[PDB]
Write a protein that binds this ligand. Structure first.
Ligand SMILES: *CCCCCCOCCOCCNC(=O)c1ccc2c(c1)[C@]1(c3ccc(N)cc3[Si](C)(C)c3cc(NC)ccc31)N(C#N)C2=O
Ligand SMILES: [Cl-]
Length: 292
């Protein structure tokens, strides 16, 4: 699996801040918008995009506060990311899009899709945000960790002072061992502890056991939208997963209309790091079946 990131940097001013993004592939045609989550960046797409860019434009932004994007003094609530992603999509003048989304990137993509349904030609998604009704539906191995994350005192000392979301959660989200070069790429935006606020606010926003109820409600709404939408859907899943265990992937593959599900083999959260070749080639094949 490749550790390089060859893409030329592109930047765009969004709401007064500079955001970075990858932009490759043909300039014509429907673009494919790749949205990463916590605590990654466009780096998480580096081995997927080269499968897609020969036939379709690939756009991969770094979320505000993340990757090579600027670091405004925000709370980095989900609502902050929604505002910046909305403004990024409009700054690039995108019209219709295909989404490829993961983790908090999927909460962004699904929520944008619900509000802009005529502009979404397909959604590929993996290890995505859905409501977790009780802590029992969270993986046992990860339960005490995430309960501690979701506190002001203990959670900030773990995530901000000790950088535990980068040095622990991230490699614990990949089945294979991440290399030192790959870790350094994920570390780069967060070398300064003051810049780690998004790493801590994100898990405090996760819709688990009914809280925070505003996120639970927003996620419920876009899942209800997704269940009733004819949009083409491509779901990647792994064993044992984290957000989407295999029994949930099986349930969704039946319940979501127009859905193809792909078993990538072993995986936790960052499926892209365990089987990028299958995810990228399967996306390129799925795209070639779409009306775009
Ligand atoms: C958008 C959602 C993204 C999900 C990304 C990946 O999520 C899945 C993995 O997240 C990490 C979940 N925690 C564990 O898997 C785990 C399992 C056992 C033990 C820990 C954590 C433990 C630990 C062990 C080694 C290191 N280097 C660090 C850690 Si901690 C500081 C993250 C930790 C904290 C807590 N309480 C807050 C309990 C255990 C750990 N640990 C120890 N000691 C384990 O035995
Ligand atoms: Cl998170």
């Amino acid at each position: 699996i490749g550790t390089g990131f060859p893409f030329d940097p592109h930047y765009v001013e969004v709401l007064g801040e500079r955001m970075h993004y990858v932009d490759v592939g043909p300039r014509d045609g429907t673009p494919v918008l790749f949205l990463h989550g916590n605590p990654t960046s466009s780096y998480v797409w580096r081995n997927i995009i080269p499968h897609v860019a020969p036939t379709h434009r690939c756009i991969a932004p770094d979320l505000i506060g993340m990757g090579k994007s600027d670091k405004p003094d925000l709370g980095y609530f989900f609502d902050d990311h929604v505002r910046f992603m909305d403004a990024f999509i409009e700054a690039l003048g995108l019209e219709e899009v295909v989404l490829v989304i993961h983790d908090w990137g999927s909460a962004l993509g699904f929520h944008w899709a619900k509000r802009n349904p005529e502009r979404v030609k397909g959604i590929a998604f993996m290890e995505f945000i859905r409501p977790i009704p009780t802590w029992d539906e969270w993986p046992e191995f990860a339960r005490e960790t995430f309960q501690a994350f979701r506190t002001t005192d203990v959670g900030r000392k773990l995530i901000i002072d000790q950088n535990v979301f980068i040095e622990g959660t991230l490699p614990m989200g990949v089945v294979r061992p991440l290399t030192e070069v790959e870790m350094d790429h994920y570390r780069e935006p967060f070398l300064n502890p003051v810049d780690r606020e998004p790493l801590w606010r994100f898990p405090n926003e996760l819709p688990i056991a009914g809280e925070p109820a505003n996120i639970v409600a927003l996620v419920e709404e876009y899942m209800d939208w997704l269940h009733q939408s004819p949009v083409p859907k491509l779901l990647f899943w792994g064993t044992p997963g984290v957000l989407i265990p295999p029994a949930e992937a099986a349930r969704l593959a039946k319940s979501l209309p127009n859905c193809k599900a792909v078993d990538i083999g072993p995986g936790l959260n960052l499926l892209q790091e365990d089987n990028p070749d299958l995810i990228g080639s399967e996306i390129a094949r799925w795209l070639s079946t779409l009306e775009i």
